[PDB]
Symmetry: D3
Subunit: 78 residues, 6 copies
């Protein structure tokens, strides 16, 4: 689950950033749903859920984890 | 649109959760847009807006209502 | 960017906000097109956008608020 | 499977039409993915695949079945 | 906003194959243009499906995709 | 590097290929359709008129006289 997700970060994670309770993941064009699917399937305790657009994913942090901490988590796994 | 929304929450709402000012609603795969449409049309006074992904809807709470209080309202129709 | 400004005039139905989020409404189907221009404008106080069908969430960079982003969009339009 | 999809048709199938090897299904706003997921999961031998837009689904007929025949089949299930 | 104004603003290219007109738009515009086409209620259009930058417009028999594509092209 | 990136992603993302008439129908894992279709689009194959992606399906529209079956066989064999 997490392993499959971490593999995909390599190719699919262009950058991370955050604001408040949100991690904002940028992907290549069109890749948001594919990387978001892998994140959802990993069912991280830190993650309430995700919404994918086209090249951006909003990852909603489960309190008290912050978006900045989630962003650092994804960066470390890349 | 409140009654139609309630019917659709009954049919399509798999789970609710929250973080900060956000209620996170899960649906079966592909049903997020149809349910989010029903929510938008209800024009709830404590809802700023919604975005639907594929199986997840972010519903933005209007202060002073929190994501948790919003999710609780939805959950009570699930 | 004024590609963004042109599309705000064309597509921005209304603005609203909550916490660190500006909520932009567009005609049905037009959210991705507006959001693209916003992304391309690369505003310092915008962390990113997610477009649905008729709604865009614009994530404000701390300590900018969603209300402030909303007013900026009204200003550029 | 087909049962499940068939019970959606009263609510989700606004109209059917065809051209060549294609059936064009119209749905309410946002329901295209919701109905198309159900069609995909029915795994009909006369359907090669589907693409959902927002209020339209393109259902691709498996030869020798024509779009018009597929359209009739959905109408007959409704 | 009307198809007849948006075709010029939103079309990158028109092309065709068989019963399909294939329209390309800038990134993210497919649904916005396709909405306009849907609302134009053209007798020779069975329906549209939009992805992100591409729309398939289904020609009503016996109209061909080339005939539809020509119409979209000429109104740009 | 357009065609090579496409060839890589076909192997990684194709679940199955099929066809009907002037269409190749490509199936991907859930959510991967746009990312695969992007690569196809960027490869700009002279026999592909365009593509449309849903969530887990892609239609690739063949340029006449190339058929859906010919494109599908080309895609299948790049896996
Ligand atoms: N080709 C596009 N749709 N571009 C716009 C993307 C808008 C927004 N960043 C999202 O991912 O939802
Ligand atoms: N089949 C898929 N698209 N799965 C991924 C969904 C990603 C995210 N939960 C969303 O709803 O937007
Ligand atoms: N035609 C529709 N898809 N309507 C529902 C829109 C739901 C939500 N406001 C969004 O923009 O994502
Ligand atoms: N609200 C909208 N997205 N409207 C445009 C729909 C375009 C096309 N009929 C489709 O379903 O793909
Ligand atoms: N940014 C993207 N989603 N790019 C891929 C577009 C794929 C296909 N041409 C469509 O419009 O459905
Ligand atoms: N999770 C989903 N959206 N499933 C439905 C997919 C519908 C259709 N096969 C498409 O790709 O457009």
């Amino acid at each position: 689950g997490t392993d499959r997700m971490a593999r995909l970060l390599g190719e699919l994670l262009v950058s991370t950033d955050d604001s408040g309770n949100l991690a904002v993941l940028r992907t290549p064009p069109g890749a948001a749903h594919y990387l978001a699917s892998a994140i959802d399937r990993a069912a991280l305790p830190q993650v309430v859920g995700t919404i994918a657009g086209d090249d951006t994913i909003l990852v909603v942090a489960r309190e008290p984890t912050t978006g900045a901490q989630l962003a650092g988590m994804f960066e470390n796994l890349r």
